[PDB]
Design a protein around this nucleic acid. Sequence first.
RNA 1: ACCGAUAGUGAACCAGUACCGUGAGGGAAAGGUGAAAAGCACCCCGGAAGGGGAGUGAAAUAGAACCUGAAACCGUGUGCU
RNA 2: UGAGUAGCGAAAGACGGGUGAGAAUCCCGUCCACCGAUUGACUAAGGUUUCCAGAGGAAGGCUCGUCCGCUCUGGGUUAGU
Lengths: 121, 50, 111, 87, 44
Amino acid sequence: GYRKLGRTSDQRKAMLRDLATSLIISERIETTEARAKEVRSVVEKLITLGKKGDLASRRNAAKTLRNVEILNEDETTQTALQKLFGEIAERYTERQGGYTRILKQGPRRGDGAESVIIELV
Amino acid sequence: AVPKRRTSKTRKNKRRTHFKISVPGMTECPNCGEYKLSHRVCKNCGSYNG
Amino acid sequence: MEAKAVARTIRIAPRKVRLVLDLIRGKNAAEAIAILKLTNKASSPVIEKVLMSALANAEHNYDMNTDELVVKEAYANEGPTLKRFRPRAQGRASAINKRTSHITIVVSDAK
Amino acid sequence: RDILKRPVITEKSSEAMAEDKYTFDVDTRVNKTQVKMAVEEIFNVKVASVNIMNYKPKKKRMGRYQGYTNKRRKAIVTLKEGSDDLF
Amino acid sequence: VKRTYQPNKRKHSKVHGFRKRMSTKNGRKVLARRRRKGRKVLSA
RNA sequence: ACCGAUAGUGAACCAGUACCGUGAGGGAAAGGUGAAAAGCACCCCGGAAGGGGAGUGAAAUAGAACCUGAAACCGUGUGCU
RNA sequence: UGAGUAGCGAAAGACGGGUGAGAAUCCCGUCCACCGAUUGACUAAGGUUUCCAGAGGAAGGCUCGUCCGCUCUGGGUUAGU
């Protein structure tokens, strides 16, 4: 891969999928600097599958996104996959790459770790 | 392995010569007026606006 | 004219505090609050509350403007330590020292 | 006789199930056959049943003087006719 | 690993009890030595 | 022509007590504000603790961790090198 | 002194919203993971108020702590079988 992030193989894929599905329901999350550079590539590849729209793209995106009930729609229990391919894919129909922006906050208390904020542009 | 001899005040104070820390490297933000770190947001009222 | 402020029975160890007091020593009153606020040591919020009250004494009790106050003296002394015990293998027991320090900040006006 | 020592007013057994049952304190050498007859002699009522429990001493003043609290014997009576065993 | 002290209320009262020391003449001398010194508890 | 708090009884102190052993049994540490509480009203920083002033007192670096306050040891300045 | 050195005692966590001077560590929600002839449910010995509620953050907890089997103030064991 790219960087191990201090975990094992099976634990790393369960954590990267947890952050990607969180950046779709909230569009802005706080995390660590090293983990923000890795989820930056996981989400930007899922938006590319949403701009295609084929049935082969909806199934290639069901391997990453978890099953959560976004209430962003505010009605009918919309899934984390139904928000994708919809309002998210329409916002970046003309943008070619670079759908992520990370901002730096500072070292946190008790850990000395770089807190950051990653959000959809 | 144990120390064969005691340690002096001279030898103890020479080793801690480089046991120091440096200035955080801060600058001034011309939106909040207060000091802040580089490539980061003003922790007081304001934002990055790079 | 001077203004002092002392913090006694501070649980943080002394030689861990002296690493930060060697940074604000000699600086201005504005440059020192920023240096202490943008660092991430354990004794950072403690030294700042002691330097802040030393400026409150310089304006209420004494009469001087804080526009040109500099940090004149900063140092840390010892205190009454706490004796503890850590159980080790084969029945042995070791000693643990919960140390204590005294913080002192002196501001002045240079006149 | 003066078998009853004091009445007890608490959150439980007082203001909750207190209109029909009454919680008292007695001496630690009495049985419920005497507690039953002593209530009828002071308040002129008729008692249905009596339940009595014991309590062990409890430590107090954690610090310099570490002593023990006295033990007690709690009783709970139920009346068939009459009321107002306390005010 | 099993230790050497297993608590027991009956075994502690049937060997070191007050009535156990008051039944023998050599045990009656144990209560006397602790009274002379001034101990708080006599038999335990 | 005895001791003066490492001394004098193990114990000046609420001690054969904390505590340690299944048990018989073994066993410490800890005195001193001031003549008198007259034990710091009120103001300022702080969430507190602790401080800076003002007051009490002959004295507060006599403020209950309270008479005098030695050495080891840990520090902050400077004259020569 | 050794020295800011060894160690911090088998193991999967992530994010959003709250509380507050101060949160990787407390609360609520969702997703994910572990045990399941047992890391689940009853009981004897033994311990002896560690049980519950509202308050507290000096010491104890191998970090933090607004939390606690810790501190403070009130409560809680009902039998003719």
